[PDB]
Amino acid sequence: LSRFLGPRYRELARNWIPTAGMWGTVGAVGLVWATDWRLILDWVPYINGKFK
Amino acid sequence: ATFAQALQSVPETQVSILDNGLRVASEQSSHATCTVGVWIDAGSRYETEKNNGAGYFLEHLAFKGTKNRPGNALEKEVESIGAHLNAYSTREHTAYLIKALSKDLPKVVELLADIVQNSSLEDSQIEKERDVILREMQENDASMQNVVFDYLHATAFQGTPLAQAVEGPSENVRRLSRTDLTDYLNRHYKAPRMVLAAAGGVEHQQLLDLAQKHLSSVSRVYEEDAVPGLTPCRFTGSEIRHRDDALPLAHVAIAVEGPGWANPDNVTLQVANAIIGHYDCTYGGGVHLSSPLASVAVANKLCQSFQTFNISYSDTGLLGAHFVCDAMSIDDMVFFLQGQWMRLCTSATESEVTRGKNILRNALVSHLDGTTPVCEDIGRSLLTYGRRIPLAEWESRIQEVDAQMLRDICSKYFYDQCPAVAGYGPIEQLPDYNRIRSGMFWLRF
Amino acid sequence: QPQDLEFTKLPNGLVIASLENYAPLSRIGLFVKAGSRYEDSNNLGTSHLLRLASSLTTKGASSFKITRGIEAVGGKLSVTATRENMAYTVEGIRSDIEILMEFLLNVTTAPEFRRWEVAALRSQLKIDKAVAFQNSQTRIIENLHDVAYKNALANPLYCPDYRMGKITSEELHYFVQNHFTSARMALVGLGVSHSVLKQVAEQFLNMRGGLGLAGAKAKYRGGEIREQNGDNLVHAAIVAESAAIGNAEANAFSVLQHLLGAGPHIKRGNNTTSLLSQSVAKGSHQPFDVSAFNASYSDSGLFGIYTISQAAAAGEVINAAYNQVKAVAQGNLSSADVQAAKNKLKAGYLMSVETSEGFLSEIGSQALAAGSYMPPSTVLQQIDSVADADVVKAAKKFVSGKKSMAASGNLGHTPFLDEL
Amino acid sequence: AALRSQLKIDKAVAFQNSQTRIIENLHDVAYKNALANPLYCPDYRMGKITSEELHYFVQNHFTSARMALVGLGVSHSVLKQVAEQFLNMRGGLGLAGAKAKYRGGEIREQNGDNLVHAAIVAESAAIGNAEANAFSVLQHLLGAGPHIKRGNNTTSLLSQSVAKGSHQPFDVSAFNASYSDSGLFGIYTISQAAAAGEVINAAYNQVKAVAQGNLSSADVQAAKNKLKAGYLMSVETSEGFLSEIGSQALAAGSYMPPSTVLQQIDSVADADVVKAAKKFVSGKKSMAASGNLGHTPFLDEL
Amino acid sequence: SSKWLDGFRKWYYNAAGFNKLGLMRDDTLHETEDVKEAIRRLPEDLYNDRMFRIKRALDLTMRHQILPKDQWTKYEEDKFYLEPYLKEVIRERKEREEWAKK
Amino acid sequence: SHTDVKVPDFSDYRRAEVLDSTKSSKESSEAR
Amino acid sequence: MTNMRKTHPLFKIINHSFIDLPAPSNISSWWNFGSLLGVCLMVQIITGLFLAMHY
Amino acid sequence: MTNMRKTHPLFKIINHSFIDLPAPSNISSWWNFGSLLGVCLMVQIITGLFLAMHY
Amino acid sequence: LVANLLILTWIGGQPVEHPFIIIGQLASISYFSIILILMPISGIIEDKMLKLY
Amino acid sequence: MLSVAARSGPFAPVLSATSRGVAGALRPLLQGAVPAASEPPVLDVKRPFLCRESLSGQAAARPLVATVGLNVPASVRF
Ligand code: HEM
Ligand code: HEM
């Protein structure tokens, strides 16, 4: 509750924003690559070729 | 008075150059005593594997007799005036220093000149000091932290002149002869590589006059027009293990390549080393220590001691930690020390940065308290910086150090870098090099 | 502008001193007369546990608050204890010396001494005693004080193994409330203002104002104790009764100590001016280390010879050193040797003073002992005023006095007092 | 190497009680050599004693001229047959010794025990002397221990003198230990921490009165009767009889019958008892003390 | 006013049931980290009394019985021995959390 | 003594950018 | 000789989990239901094995 | 702070069995066949699960 | 809560007519509100009742 | 020069015991370590002595003698 509400924990969180966002980006691209998500993969120019 | 105006009220030092290039530096204080020494840029990095014990053996023979004062007349003079005569040798620098009163400065300068430029090496005295240095090598390998430091230097700078120890191997000790010592003396005791540093109750003009009287015309000439040059040393990420289970405790030192003397990141790495810190079993802090590694060590009874060190040489060095622990907690201490290193690399915080800055300021000024340590600082600073860095400039750099640039320099010098590991004792618990590197990086950044 | 010591006597018995040199670091020392000599047989080791209890919970600051605050400002707190005295020193920047000084005053004056905390601290006490007794010199010195004195100074500086685990918060509170009284306390400071140190002393030094429990006067018993431990390097200290500290005879004994040799001035040296080293090296080719041991506390002093030698040559080394001191007592010494000894003594005194920690210790010890500060030039004057006949009298007093030996090692050839 | 741990355990079990430690310290501070050697292995010497040292000790001291093979319920022919069948191949007298010079002195082990032990002794005669016989009679006169379970010890002069001015539990006795060339006679006191000085001073003043000559011939005869009864009860057990036979064979090389032993015990005179008490009073002192010694006196205070 | 509150607290203390097993409130306190630290900070006699009361309660609830009516812990004599130790432990913990916060 | 402990030559296994000891690393650690 | 029950590895696992396990002395009949669930699982495994044997 | 791999019980078992298992450094390629047997067992289990899903 | 679970079992047994819809709705609402809200508030109430703070 | 450090030259760190209750900024020389000191064996507690009647008989009056055996307990007689 109030344990993680302070300036030190806030600046730790701000330091970890780019890493957490990068890991979320990795998870998103891995999800669309594994599931072959059409709605995202009809925009990148090369991978558009195989779906036709 | 505040810290800034106190540090600017600390008096400056005076540096002058003679005709031969020998530097003369002094700092005048209010004490009734003084420390006057000669710092010479000679050591194991200059020795070339055939004269590896030459500098330290000359350190032995410096006070055992000179040309003007044969035998122990120099010792009698120093003891009669009541001075303390000391010397040390390190892979960069050799220092011959005298602590005395302010009224015996001409005698101190004359004795220093007689020690440096007028060394006499008798064959019988060479044999006696050869016996003494062999016994000292036995008493030194009876110790353990010096063994680990030598092993770390060897495994980190293997194939380079920086790997060889100050004492030299026993074969070079037994084969060293007077001609090779005189060759080392006439090759490495030139004027431009010597600074005469006086600190305490000294007058700069009087010291300069004494330098022009005694330290004038030391060699000035190599007699072959062959000036030695210090090539850069290759850092080798590597591991040396010396397993011997009869020893009760295990010493492990893990280091990486340092920044060098001239690198401005040395202050930041000293801040990080102050954040991580040092600890031994006699500390009364307990679990309440601000250092997380020390607190975990106290709580889990991991190590007897640890310390962070930052040794610097000409554009190189060793930056890391050394710990003494039992045979069953080496893996735990390596894991926690690596975790602390990556925590400083990735998620260092401003409170820890401020704490480390205060600790570095206090340690720096407390080390620059005392006539003999400030004389040491003057000599070493004129040897490796070309000048003496004022405490105001040090405080300015420390204030310039903040959290983001600490994380940047820590990631530059620690993240994903191949380390040098030196283990001695029951080091079965010490993991392999692959595991140490896997601890040296993180899978979550 | 480096000012002199502002020195005053706050009327509850307190001694206040301050030197404002505008040093970048300030240092506050508080010196109490609560050494191990004020214990009796029922509270041995209480001084050791109190020395190690400097980072516990106080009435105004918890242990966590003390440790984390001092490390957060970067300062350091240390306790230096000798058999008569205990000094609490704090070190830090001028911008935080208010809260460091407040923490030191809390620790020295208002300790909680919770029972679980000292029960946890007993293990660290055992660790500290082991680390201290790693080297045999201090073991010889505690053995020597134990065999030399009867009650007061015979109490060891470290807690005995039977008292390890029997010291309690009741005994700690009794010791603090009986010896930490303001009439035995000196609050000295370097880099701090006399006005601010005086006002904090008046503000938070008004709860204990007695004279304190007067300790028993130390008595001399003499005799020998030996520690057969099989080390080939035999240590042996042979001392005798000398004068108390702050005496002309004490000055003569210090001059005699530096005449006979009080440590090396050259590393890896031969100690050519040390008469003991010359006498030993004239008879033995084995390695050795012989010096003069002097230790003067406020009641009395011990003077003698400390020898480290081989197991076989211990007898001849000890006999040669004793014969050298006998020759000095009979009067076989030179005025040049006495002058060199005086020069060594005054130089060593000045190099002790020149560092800020040594200067603090000297100011606090002088404030506790004499009640007033003695400037160094007068100490130079006294050392010069020591005569050679006083050195002869001091050596004669040593050789004629009853002796105490503490020995350790392989004692197949170490002699006894009847053979010396 | 496996047995040195058993050495450590056996020393701990031996030092479970404090009288062993007191007697070891007493010999250690009474003699310079040859009797100051501890009967148990030192803590540093645990882990250091070698089979080479054991073989050296056996080859230098387990020799034929210093052994005696005695037997009860066995034939002399069988005994001598096995004697020349085994014990014929050892050298001779071997190493002599060091004559056990006396030194005096005192040590005080403060260990916080609930009772204070203190032994104050001096030199006496060796085994085979009328002076030693007088010292043993003097020991039994001053009280060698209780003959009655849970008794008051009404005849022992040390217990009477201490109980005259004490109201605390105590145990005072005359310690006697003779050897081949030297002896130790003194007082052993176990008392409270506060009353230790009073107990030691009362015992020392009682022995001083005995030395001055405050004694009766009836008490000397009772002491001789106690000594005769103790010696005969030592002999009456076959274990004690074998031990006495072996000790006599090693010491004198001849049999002294118990009738002749009691004859010389009766031949002990009371003037020699006074002389032995005076010798203990005037002799140099060795003190071994342990406990809580806030009030235990020193040797110069006695 | 508050007398009715005291009587209602008395009735609830009877209804809770730990008086029937010879227990106290601090005996029935669940051991978290702060509670275990307080129990470790307890003196020897209070530790022994608490531990015996816990053992007797376990024996009674194993037998599925209670103490006799005259042997119950009355609400007047139900002393709170763990309150100062628990309060100082929570105070030290909160100081630690605030220091880690800043 | 412990000073005689010297690391043997590993030049049969070193990388192409590491074979010399007169050239410092960290110009090739990134590449490796 | 040795204690097979606490030195044999499978035997010492069984002993440390089920035989010499320190259990609370006062747990009621409601604590039997874990073993009831385990024996239910075993019984259903056997009976369903026979059902799939003939199914 | 503690070591989760050496403290958490499932992680402790995995660490003592497969992660920090003291293994001889000189075992040949013939010692990989235990892991190959385990991997083939897992492959057979999954593959037969799909076969009986359609069988 | 146990009683409400029995109510939910019986409601799942019976079909969708009046008043089974509103009985099941009230049963589910009471179930969720008890197991999320009422037990912790009642625990706080008992702590204040036995004077824990 | 009214202090142990200013009077005893090399004996100052021997006569003075320094304890750093809070870790300093600079590292200390000769940190030291406890090399795992052994533990004495656990033995049965010998009885105390509270009355003089049971106290009598335990003051030594004969030389110390030890006795070990193959199958008899190791005794000591005073
Ligand atoms: C190895 C374990 C098991 C096997 C092989 C197995 C096999 C089977 C088979 C073959 C049937 C069909 C026969 C029939 O419907 O009457 C069945 C039915 C059933 N099984 Fe299992 N079963 C196993 C375990 C379980 C478990 C663990 C449960 C419950 C948690 C369970 C619950 C049921 C139920 C409820 C039926 C329906 C029977 C009916 O409605 O008549 N089974 N099982
Ligand atoms: C959980 C584990 C397994 C399951 C569920 C399973 C299931 C099956 C099924 C349903 C079939 C018939 C499908 C077909 O043959 O087309 C089959 C065939 C077979 N299984 Fe398995 N199986 C398992 C494990 C194994 C193992 C461990 C082995 C051998 C070590 C094995 C060996 C075979 C063989 C040899 C066949 C016949 C293939 C052929 O005739 O070509 N199976 N299995």
Q: Which amino acid is at C173?
A: H
SS3 C403: strand
Sequence-separated (6 or more) residues with CB below 8 Å from residue D284: D102, D104, D122, D123
CB I12 within 8 A of CB I20: no
Q: Which residues are registered as beta bridge partners of C224?
A: C405
Residue C281 at interface with chain J, using a CB cutoff of 8 Å: no
Catalytic positions of B: 59
**Does the beta carbon of G38 sit less than 6 angstroms from any atom of ligand 1?**
no
Q: Which residues contact A29 (CB under 8 A, 6 or more apart)?
A: none
State the best of D27, D150, D152, D200 to mutate against chain J, taking most chain J CBs within 10 Å. D150
Q: Any alpha helices (H) in B142-242, and if so which ranges?
A: 145-156, 170-175, 178-188, 204-214
Sign of CA dihedral D136, D138, D144, D146: positive
CA of B200: how far to CAs of A27, B346, H1, in Å?
65, 44, 48
Measured between alpha carbons, how far is B253 from B421 in angstroms, rounded to an integer? 6
Q: Does G29 lie at the interface with E, CB-CB under 8 angstroms? A: no
Q: Is D23 at the interface with chain J, CB within 8 A? A: yes
Question: For residue B144, what is the nearest residue in chain F, using CA coordinates?
Answer: F2
**Tokens at residue F1, please?**
């003594």
Residue of F nearest to B150 (CA): F3
The pairing of strands C185-190 and C14-19 is parallel
What residues of chain E lie within 8 A of the CB of G30, using their CB? none
D72-95 core/surface letters (b: 16 or more CB in 10 A; e: else): eeeeeeeeeeeeeeeeeeeeeeee
Asked if D106's CB is within 8 angstroms of C223's CB, the reply is: yes
Q: Does B288 touch chain A (CB under 8 A)?
A: no
**CA torsion sign, C115 to C121 to C126 to C129?**
negative
Using DSSP, state whether B134 is helix, strand or coil: helix
Residues whose CB is less than 8 angstroms from the CB of residue B35 and which lie 6 or more positions away in sequence, other chains included: B97, B98, B99, B100, B198, B199, B200, B371, B372, B374, B375, B376
Distance CA D56, CA D65 (A): 17
Q: In angstroms, how far is CA C206 from the centroid of its own chain?
A: 29
Residue F21: C-alpha distances to residues B229, D36, F28 (Å): 15, 65, 13
Token reading at D149: 């379970």
Which helix (H) or strand (E) covers residue D80, if one does? helix D76-86
Nearest residue (by CA) to ligand 2, atom 15, is H51
Q: Which of C33, C93, C256, C362 has the most J C-beta neighbours within 10 Å, making it the best mutation to test the interface with J? A: C362
Cis peptide before I19 (omega within 30 of 0): yes
CB within 8 Å: D14 and J66: yes
Length of chain B: 445
Q: What is the DSSP string of E44-80?
A: HHHHHHHHHHHHHHHHHHHHT----GGGS--TTT---
Specify the residue with its C-alpha closest to ligand 2, atom 26.
H44
> Sheet harboring D171-178: ordered strands across?
D105-110, D286-291, D116-124, D183-191, D171-178
Instruction: Give me the sign of the Cα torsion angle B241, B244, B245, B251.
Output: negative
Query: Which mutation among G46, G51, G53 tests ligand 1's pocket best, with the greatest number of atoms within 8 A of CB?
Result: G51
Contacts of G26 in chain E (CB under 8 A): 58-59, 61-62
d(C-alpha B242, C-alpha D177), whole Å: 56
Q: What residues of E are in contact with residue A9 (Cβ under 8 Å)?
A: 101
- Residue H43 CA, ligand 2 centroid: distance in Å: 11
Q: Residue C416 corresponds to which amino acid?
A: F
Q: Which residues line ligand 2 (CB under 6 A)?
A: H 44-45, 48-49, 51-52, 55
Query: Using a 6 Å cutoff on CB, does residue G48 contact ligand 1?
Result: yes
C306 beta partners:
C237, C291
Q: Is G10 in the pocket of ligand 1 (CB under 6 A)?
A: no
Query: Residue C229 and residue C349: Cα distance in Å, rounded?
Result: 36
Judge: B307–J21 Cβ closer than 8 Å, yes or no: no
Tell me the resolution in Å: 3.5
CB B21 within 8 A of CB B358: no
Q: What distance in angstroms lies between residue H48's CA and the mean position of ligand 2's atoms? A: 6
Residue from C31, C157, B158, G3 nearest F25 by CA: B158
Number of Cβ atoms within 10 Å of the Cβ of C307: 26
User: CB-side exposure of B409: number of CA atoms within 13 Å?
Assistant: 19
* Ligand 1 centroid distance, CA of G44 (Å): 7
User: Measured between alpha carbons, how far is I5 from I28 in angstroms, rounded to an integer?
Assistant: 9
Inter-chain CB proximity A16 and B351 less than 8 Å: no
Burial degree of D203 (CB within 10 A; 0-12, 13-18, 19+): buried
Which helix (H) or strand (E) segment holds residue F27: the answer is none
Chain E residues closer than 8 Å to I48 by CB: none
Task: Find the residue in G nearest to E54 (Cα).
Answer: G26
Give the C-alpha distances (Å, rounded to integers) separating D279 from D139, D210, D217.
13, 11, 20
Six token digits for residue C51: 């020395």
E59 touches chain G (CB under 8 A): yes
Q: Which residue in chain D is spatially nearest to J48 when comparing CA positions?
A: D114
Q: What torsion do the CA atoms of D294, D296, D298, D302 make, to the nearest 10 degrees? A: 140
Q: Please indicate whether, in this complex, the C-beta atoms of B159 and F3 are within 8 angstroms of each other.
A: no
Q: Where are the domains of chain A?
A: 1-52
Instruction: Give me the residue from J25, J32, J35 closest to B280, CB to CB.
Output: J32
In this complex, do B358 and C73 lie within 8 Å of one another by their Cβ atoms?
yes
Looking at beta carbons, which residues of chain C come within 8 Å of D293? Answer: 41
How many other CB atoms sit within 10 Å of the CB of residue E97?
A: 12
Q: Is the CB of residue G53 below 6 angstroms from any atom belonging to ligand 1?
A: no
Task: Give phi and psi for G16, each to the nearest 5.
Answer: -75, -20
Ligand nearest to the CA of H41: 2
For residue H45, the ligand closest to its alpha carbon is 2
Query: Within an 8 Å CB–CB cutoff, is residue H1 touching chain B?
Result: yes
Q: Which of B159, B169, B232 sits opposite F24 (nearest CB)?
A: B232
Q: How far is CA H20 from CA B238, B330, H11, in A?
A: 22, 14, 11
- Distance (Å, whole) CA B256 – CA B316: 10
Determine if ligand 1 sits within 6 Å of the CB of residue G30.
no
Interface test with E, best of A8, A10, A12 (most E CBs within 10 A): A8
**B401 within 8 A of B265, measured Cβ to Cβ:** no
Instruction: Please answer yes or no on whether D103 and C160 come within 8 Å at the CB atom.
Output: no
- As for chain G, the residues directly before each break of C–N over 2.5 Å are none
